[PDB]
Amino acid sequence: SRSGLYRSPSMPENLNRPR
Amino acid sequence: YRSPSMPEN
Amino acid sequence: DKNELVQKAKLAEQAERYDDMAACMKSVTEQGAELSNEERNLLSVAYKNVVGARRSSWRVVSSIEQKTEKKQQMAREYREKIETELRDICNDVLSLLEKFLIPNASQAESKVFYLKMKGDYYRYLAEVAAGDDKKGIVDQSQQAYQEAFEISKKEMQPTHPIRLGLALNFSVFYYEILNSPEKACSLAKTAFDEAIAELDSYKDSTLIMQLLRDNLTLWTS
Amino acid sequence: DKNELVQKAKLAEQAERYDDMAACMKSVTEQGAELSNEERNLLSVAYKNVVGARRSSWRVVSSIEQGAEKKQQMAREYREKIETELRDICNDVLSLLEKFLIPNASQAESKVFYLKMKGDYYRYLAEVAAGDDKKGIVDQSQQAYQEAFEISKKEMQPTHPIRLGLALNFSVFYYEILNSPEKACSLAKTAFDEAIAELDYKDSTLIMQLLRDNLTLWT
Numbered sequence: 001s002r003s004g005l006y007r008s009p010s011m012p013e014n015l016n017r018p019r
Numbered sequence: 020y021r022s023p024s025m026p027e028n
Numbered sequence: 029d030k031n032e033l034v035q036k037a038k039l040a041e042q043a044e045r046y047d048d049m050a051a052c053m054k055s056v057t058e059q060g061a062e063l064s065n066e067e068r069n070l071l072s073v074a075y076k077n078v079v080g081a082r083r084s085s086w087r088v089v090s091s092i093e094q095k096t097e098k099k100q101q102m103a104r105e106y107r108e109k110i111e112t113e114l115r116d117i118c119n120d121v122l123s124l125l126e127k128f129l130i131p132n133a134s135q136a137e138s139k140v141f142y143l144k145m146k147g148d149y150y151r152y153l154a155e156v157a158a159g160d161d162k163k164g165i166v167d168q169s170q171q172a173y174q175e176a177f178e179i180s181k182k183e184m185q186p187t188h189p190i191r192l193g194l195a196l197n198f199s200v201f202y203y204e205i206l207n208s209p210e211k212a213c214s215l216a217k218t219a220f221d222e223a224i225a226e227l228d229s230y231k232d233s234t235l236i237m238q239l240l241r242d243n244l245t246l247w248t249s
Numbered sequence: 250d251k252n253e254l255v256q257k258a259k260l261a262e263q264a265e266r267y268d269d270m271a272a273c274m275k276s277v278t279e280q281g282a283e284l285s286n287e288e289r290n291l292l293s294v295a296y297k298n299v300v301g302a303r304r305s306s307w308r309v310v311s312s313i314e315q316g317a318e319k320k321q322q323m324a325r326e327y328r329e330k331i332e333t334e335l336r337d338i339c340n341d342v343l344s345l346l347e348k349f350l351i352p353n354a355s356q357a358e359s360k361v362f363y364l365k366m367k368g369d370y371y372r373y374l375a376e377v378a379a380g381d382d383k384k385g386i387v388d389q390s391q392q393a394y395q396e397a398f399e400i401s402k403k404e405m406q407p408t409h410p411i412r413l414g415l416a417l418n419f420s421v422f423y424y425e426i427l428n429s430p431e432k433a434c435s436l437a438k439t440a441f442d443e444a445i446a447e448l449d450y451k452d453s454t455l456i457m458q459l460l461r462d463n464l465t466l467w468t
């Protein structure tokens with residue numbers, strides 16, 4: 001659903017170091 | 020860690 | 029042009045650009061007229077996001093400095109870099125509060141709110157101050173909060189979210205800055221109890237009450 | 250020293266200070282040496298966060314541009330401010346790719362990684378391009394992906410997360426830059442099936458889920 005909050009469903013920034 | 024103060028909203 | 033800067037600040041908020049939002053609301057404040065409730069909220073939201081980012085960032089880098097040979101030098105030099113941004117942000121807000129916002133505040137509501145804010149931003153400097161200026165900055169924070177506390181006891185209902193919010197933050201000052209869990213717990217408990225007493229038209233108050241009680245339950249067992 | 254800058258970039262990452270992170274990893278790239286797997290991901294993560302915040306705010310502000318007269322000139326002007334930041338960021342990344350990264354990639358893996366980035370950042374310019382430059386900017390994005398796709402298909406196994414990652418993004422290019430629900434669903438479905446076919450690590454299976462989520466959505 002395309003509104004002003006819509007994210008393009010490409011590669012996200014996952015598998016990185018959380019604390 | 021969070022400081023349990025007033026949030027924004 | 030005061031109206032246009034406010035509309036620009038609202039756009040920045042939607043855009044989640046907080047430095048822009050801050051810049052705009054700073055300029056509004058600098059025109060010297062008393063802020064509306066909406067302008068007040070935009071100002072505080074803006075700077076809270078700006079200061080908040082540095083605070084979290086400071087905490088993370090502080091954690092690393094402890095756990096880190098001369099690699100822990102680099103963390104320290106980065107922490108210092110983050111502090112000078114933090115201190116400049118706090119000193120901006122504090123100037124606005126002295127030169128404009130606190131003197132023009134014509135209602136108790138506005139005065140408590142801006143004194144609370146003053147308390148908050150000295151509390152942020154105190155979190156990050158060295159032992160020479162710490163107790164002096166801690167003092168300023170405690171005064172501002174105390175003055176706000178007195179005014180809101182005489183002038184505002186126990187359910188007023190600004191009074192409850194002051195209570196919440198002032199508890200936190202006592203717990204985190206001075207090391208008094210029971211002095212913090214008292215303030216939060218009475219504020220909460222006093223609010224429950226006035227029950228027997230706002231939903232933000234009950235949210236703040238829930239936060240008060242969450243701090244109690246945490247801070248003691 | 251390269252190791253100083255790389256370790257700063259990691260501190261900057263943990264601090265969520267992505268302008269600092271990107272600056273550090275730019276300096277590393279500018280020293281002319283081929284980056285490690287760690288270094289290219291640091292660079293990629295940094296710039297993706299820096300450009301991503303502009304893309305997000307651009308969309309919100311453009312969407313407000315959809316009423317009055319003087320209010321919507323201000324949104325327009327602000328959008329333009331955001332675009333000019335967005336383009337400066339995209340053009341920093343593309344210069345690094347042209348002058349250092351793409352010409353020094355000794356392996357097919359990193360060649361495909363960088364050609365995908367080139368694709369990505371030209372796609373971000375294309376989202377923000379006007380009537381004139383769009384078709385030319387849009388085709389630069391396409392060539393970058395196409396070359397990446399070709400190298401990927403002969404040199405890399407279908408489960409490799411760079412191959413799958415390229416596919417997801419190249420699918421998204423087709424879908425929203427070129428209005429081809431067909432050529433997007435084609436790319437994505439083959440990549441998924443070809444990766445399913447060669448189950449005989451954790452990143453691969455996640456990108457596979459993302460690829461199918463895009464098919465599921467676009468049906």
Ligand SMILES: O=P(O)(O)Oc1c2c(c(OP(=O)(O)O)c3c1[C@H]1C[C@@H]3c3cc4c(cc31)[C@H]1C[C@@H]4c3ccccc31)[C@H]1C[C@@H]2c2cc3c(cc21)[C@H]1C[C@@H]3c2ccccc21
Nearest residue numbers: 020021022086087088089090091092094155203204205207
């Ligand atoms: O006993 P621990 O679980 O290891 O926690 C304490 C720590 C530490 C402690 O020493 P300190 O207070 O002089 O910094 C303490 C603790 C326990 C014992 C002491 C301490 C003090 C405090 C608290 C818990 C602890 C509550 C009340 C007071 C406090 C201030 C700020 C947030 C939370 C608290 C060190 C080491 C550790 C710690 C963690 C941090 C930090 C520093 C430390 C920096 C970065 C992060 C942080 C979060 C919030 C504010 C500041 C920081």
Ligand SMILES: O=P(O)(O)Oc1c2c(c(OP(=O)(O)O)c3c1[C@H]1C[C@@H]3c3cc4c(cc31)[C@H]1C[C@@H]4c3ccccc31)[C@H]1C[C@@H]2c2cc3c(cc21)[C@H]1C[C@@H]3c2ccccc21
Nearest residue numbers: 159162163202203204205206207208209210211212247248
């Ligand atoms: O953060 P600091 O300003 O360096 O304060 C701590 C101190 C000390 C700390 O180590 P400690 O665990 O052996 O007491 C600490 C702190 C900070 C970091 C650690 C600590 C622990 C704790 C708190 C703050 C701190 C909150 C939560 C926990 C605590 C217990 C009792 C009252 C208040 C607290 C030393 C040195 C200093 C301190 C002060 C006192 C005492 C001891 C100290 C004696 C006498 C007085 C005191 C008051 C209340 C109870 C007991 C005491």
Ligand SMILES: O=P(O)(O)Oc1c2c(c(OP(=O)(O)O)c3c1[C@H]1C[C@@H]3c3cc4c(cc31)[C@H]1C[C@@H]4c3ccccc31)[C@H]1C[C@@H]2c2cc3c(cc21)[C@H]1C[C@@H]3c2ccccc21
Nearest residue numbers: 001002003004005006008307308309311312424425426428
């Ligand atoms: O009919 P809708 O459900 O309200 O969605 C469409 C819209 C609009 C449409 O017109 P457009 O084609 O010129 O963008 C469309 C839609 C539906 C019909 C047409 C459109 C085109 C497209 C899509 C959905 C729609 C998918 C494939 C293509 C597309 C591009 C980028 C993201 C998602 C898509 C306007 C109005 C609305 C819209 C929303 C946005 C935007 C513009 C609009 C801006 C800001 C936000 C946005 C998200 C992502 C990129 C760009 C934007």
Ligand SMILES: O=P(O)(O)Oc1c2c(c(OP(=O)(O)O)c3c1[C@H]1C[C@@H]3c3cc4c(cc31)[C@H]1C[C@@H]4c3ccccc31)[C@H]1C[C@@H]2c2cc3c(cc21)[C@H]1C[C@@H]3c2ccccc21
Nearest residue numbers: 002380383423424425426427428429430431432433467468
């Ligand atoms: O991104 P745009 O250059 O604004 O493309 C759109 C157009 C048009 C749009 O309006 P429309 O919905 O009434 O056709 C749109 C677009 C964008 C915004 C709206 C639109 C709608 C849609 C898509 C993109 C767009 C994706 C999702 C939806 C769609 C249906 C079929 C294929 C692809 C899509 C007009 C003008 C243009 C267009 C092109 C064509 C056609 C019509 C148009 C005819 C002939 C060719 C075509 C291809 C496939 C099916 C039908 C056609």
